[PDB]
């Protein structure tokens with residue numbers, strides 16, 4: 001029972017979640033027998049651009065607590081020149097890990113998760129943030145509710161949007177839409193739109209190639225087909241927005 005003190009409360013480390021070096025995440029038990037995830041960042045070897053990115057992310061996380069429960073809760077934290085400890089709610093599992101296991105998903109589960117994803121991502125767009133790099137590992141399943149863990153601020157090409165390829169000034173909220181689209185698309189067809197494309201240079205070229213038509217096979221839910229098609233238009237101006245997705249039949253009508 002290795003221990004950690006945060007703002008005067010003692011946690012018992014149960015185990016580590018994943019690996020990582022510079023940051024580590026741990027499952028812990030407090031005095032009230034409640035589980036929490038504690039993120040540990042070692043700052044010993046970190047420059048100022050890096051520090052400032054960490055500090056900005058903690059600010060947005062702490063600020064957006066009050067605006068949506070589809071952002072992971074942050075109960076407390078400690079920050080010193082040497083380290084950061086952040087006491088968060090524990091998710092069951094990350095969306096990525098889960099998708100790799102699961103064969104099919106209940107359609108109601110899919111829909112419910114989708115709305116969670118939109119509620120989260122909309123909340124960050126409302127505060128001027130665009131993630132730019134959304135993937136399934138950015139979401140954590142907590143009691144059958146998806147919650148967003150990272151804002152992309154702090155320091156697989158399959159979910160990467162055309163705008164972000166054309167850059168490497170042009171990343172807007174529409175870019176996050178493409179990425180959520182990609183994630184929904186796996187959730188409906190078992191693969192991202194370009195998994196089958198082998199080389200990385202080939203994927204990147206297919207994401208931006210107007211002549212590369214994305215397969216949408218027909219499915220019972222014709223509305224879902226339409227959301228996938230709208231998220232995944234190559235021109236951001238043509239591409240559906242999040243406020244529009246929240247008003248879409250897929251989300252609104254059973």
Ligand SMILES: C[C@@H](Oc1cc(C(=O)N(C)C)ccc1Nc1nc(O[C@H]2CC[C@@](C)(O)CC2)c2c(Cl)c[nH]c2n1)C(F)(F)F
Pocket residue numbers: 016017018019025027037039072088089090091092093094097140149
């Ligand atoms: C309850 C279960 O929690 C998680 C398990 C798993 C799992 O099965 N993996 C990673 C294969 C994933 C997540 C669990 N919960 C989990 N994981 C987190 O961070 C993982 C760190 C490692 C990764 C790879 O960046 C994925 C996020 C956090 C954070 Cl920050 C806050 N709350 C969290 N809850 C535990 F491991 F604690 F038993």
